[PDB]
Symmetry: C5
Subunit: 248 residues, 5 copies
């Protein structure tokens, strides 16, 4: 339902990636004579820390005003925001960030520090088992970012489970854990609202099929928050059984 | 499905705003020869504290009897109530209020103190990325009012997290937080029922699309209540580890 | 889908109310030459404590056997029960009761003590913003009964919140609250099951639209129970921080 | 969608009941010239403790192998199991049991001790306000079995609420309650899984209408479990405020 | 919607099983002149510890690159992963594992230690009351794996309920339970995510009917996690009422 584009109009030199999805599950580097539409979307992966990249970001007409700033590093909190046709999403993992603006024709994503999550999607597109629409891509990314949180949370619980095997712990160790748990909750909560939202807002580029998935992920990430709230309330308890053993 | 109106019949002089939505995402001030229907609804934003405004509120035929009173400041609790065609909704943020009556043709909203939430919707309509139907507007408003609560709750939890780091706190500080938490819960609960309800009642002016969203918001605001119940149960705890450190 | 009735066949003399819904949102007292069907249902509001009323209740053919007893005061717990075409529902508020039997054609409701909830529905029908089908009525009633509980629960929590601001309380005050909370839970729980159920059972007279609503209400009343369970667990705690005095 | 049957092929002498549903809401004792199909299902209510009954159970061709054993008393836990066309369900109330196998044509249900729940369905069929399909019957039964648990739970909570009004309790009373609560949970939990499942598995003989109901019931029974978990966690607490009133003595 | 196969192309010698589903609820050993499609899928049950089996696993063209490694024992965590047409699922029970790759045409499953769960599905296919599509199979397996967890959790709760009756326990016993509970949670949580997901992702080979079921199972297994979290929080409590009984002697 959108205006088709020329392969040139989105050409950045030092662009980490610049792929055209085949719609069958793979990619090919974007050449000047390719057409870009819903069926074959374009994925630009920028490091907003490079010259040509941050230049292209502030200039190119393919973005609204407001997104430029945010796409350039100005956001902190996870949020989905609607720029009419386009959508500006800010996500976090493990704290590393990732800002992307997307409509049905293309996905442009800007990071500074590498995101293990976006690699998995390249590894899969290079192989041929990757996404096919923008909507799919987005799900695959959020799945990944949540796999990561889900694992990293098992690791903290892992450690907190051994501390509960108690010989007291090394001074200030219990705080470095509490700190991490809290950092996690501070960002994993809002990012869940975003997942949940994207599962409700009907965007052109997302199928009822995709929304069922964002529901998965949100509800999943949701349960992760519950396991964190637990871990935290149990580091508050271990700090009282610690100020105790050292009284008797 | 409703009777179209003349642009004049809703003309208030000191009316803070008086816009006609274009249905594309923007607005234009209401002139006498504009037509008002589902496609191009009218949004009146009154300060019920001005003469012409409170006058127009009690007079104009475009409102049922019952709403006049409430639109005029008589309500406290968040509530959606149905006046047949129209709907009277009372919402709160951060405690500031906002009463509105709306049907498919128009939205009339009355505040006394400014509501940061209704600005965001003008900022966005002036720009062209705003709502398009009454239904959309209502969601965008509720999204905003909930973004605000959500943040302000992160701020309280922020402070309560530092107090849990613990050198005692300043006398009576822990009560000013408990107080705020409780104030929030007192109003953010009923307001969540309203969200949820609006997500169930099938109004003409709201799409299955919009109801999915009111569900979002409701369930979201819902989780905010949970984070508050926590914050509170943990200020009750910190006041016992305080009567202990002062034991 | 039911047999139309004559306006006379449901005529009670001291019947508190006896209205015919217009299907537009209002009412008019029932006269002998009115027709009663799905589109214009009849609402009889009896005080089963009056002669003509309790008489008419035990006699009239318009009710099955079993309901007569219950319509007459024999029930305590909230319950929906199916008498084939008709439905017998027992509801409580604030403990005051209200028994009603309804099919698509008419609603007959019996109370002893006045129910603020059923007034609101008259106030609204007299005004013209009231229900239009039996299905709608039932939702509007349950909404009301739940608005009441919801408020009265904020009042208890209100009080329990001040007691948590603690100078000890007046002896035996904390028990009159615990008592109320528990009275509330004893009846507000089963009545939520009823709401939930009505939101599932497909009655002829209720639209998918109305069931979405009974879901609202039930889920709502549901969360009220949660706030009660809290209030109670916190009066059990306040009695230990009191014996600590 | 199943093969119609002769009225004779399911004739048991001492069979507590042996009814043919009219599909309008009532019954009539099964005679030899009645036809049995979806529209008019047959309900056999056996006491597997009688001769002719347990005989008929092990013999008659109208049951698969596997069910015979279980229909005969071999099962303990609530379960729904699929025997292709048929379905074998084991349910419990108040611990009393009830095993039944059913397809669209007929319901055969075996008990040993009387089940107040299955009476209610006879009282209602004799009167004419009872079920009409097998699917409905099954719902009405599970509604009843849950009404019973729901009430009995209010009774335990009732007593546990008075004990929390505390003068100590009679020695060993708090354990007979904890015991009951726990007994309840051990069986009411699995039985809720069964309800929930029946609300998901699409059997021929159950309408989308009936599944909405098994959902009701399951989610209801669900909340009952929650109220039990509470009751139990609060008898664990009352036994510590009791060892306290007997340490401070 | 997929390319039909010859009966030979999937022939392994020491293959524990190698069945063709009849689509009616049973099986027959795979012969060279059988056709394999959605209607009659092929089920290979391999022990990746045998020569011919692990050989066939690394060679045969009927698997993508990535799955070979994992199908061969490389995975630990429960996960569903999509290889385009196919799907690679890793599941655990009671810790024993089971890796499988499946599309609409065939299911290939690899274990090392026997899985009581996959037997039940053979016992039922040999009898004729088993699955009919790949989708059904997958539900029947997960039902089973969850029945097992559900029971084993009742057993730990069982024991934890007796310890709460309380004469102290044998030193280090309460840790062997905590350990088990924790082991269970570590794997039964992620495995629930997989169930839930399979209930959302629309695969060709799963009906809306089957998804309702994976919902069942996921929500069920869900509730088991809740009962574990409880059991654990109550072994943390019993270790404090134990360091208490051993203070005042
Ligand atoms: Zn293509
Ligand atoms: Zn990552
Ligand atoms: Zn934890
Ligand atoms: Zn227009
Ligand atoms: Zn605001
Ligand atoms: Zn907090
Ligand atoms: Zn009419
Ligand atoms: Zn009331
Ligand atoms: Zn409270
Ligand atoms: Zn017939
Ligand atoms: Zn019973
Ligand atoms: Zn209880
Ligand atoms: Zn075939
Ligand atoms: Zn197993
Ligand atoms: Zn347990």
């Amino acid at each position: 339902h959108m205006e088709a584009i020329k392969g040139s109009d989105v050409n950045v030199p030092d662009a980490v990636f610049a792929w055209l999805l085949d719609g069958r599950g793979g990619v090919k580097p974007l050449e000047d004579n390719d057409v870009i539409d819903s069926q074959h979307p374009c994925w630009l992966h920028l490091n907003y820390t490079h010259p040509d990249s941050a230049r292209w970001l502030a200039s190119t007409p393919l973005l609204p005003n407001n997104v430029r700033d945010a796409l350039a590093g100005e956001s902190s909190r996870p949020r989905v925001s609607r720029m009419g046709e386009g959508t500006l999403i800010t996500l976090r993992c493990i704290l590393v960030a990732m800002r992307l603006y997307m409509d049905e024709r293309f996905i442009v994503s800007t990071r500074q520090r590498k995101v293990l999550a976006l690699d998995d999607v390249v590894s899969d597109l290079q192989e041929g088992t990757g996404p096919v629409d923008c909507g799919g891509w987005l799900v695959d990314v959020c799945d990944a970012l949540t796999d990561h949180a889900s694992e990293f949370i098992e690791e903290l619980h892992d450690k907190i489970i051994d501390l509960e095997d108690n010989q007291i712990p090394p001074r200030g160790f219990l705080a470095l854990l509490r700190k991490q748990l809290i950092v996690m909750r501070r960002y994993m909560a809002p990012q869940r609202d975003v997942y949940a939202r994207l599962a409700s807002e009907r965007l052109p580029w997302m199928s009822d099929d995709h929304r069922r998935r964002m529901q998965d992920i949100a509800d999943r990430l949701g349960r992760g928050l519950d396991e964190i709230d637990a871990c935290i309330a149990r580091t508050g308890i271990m700090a009282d059984e610690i100020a105790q053993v050292m009284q008797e």
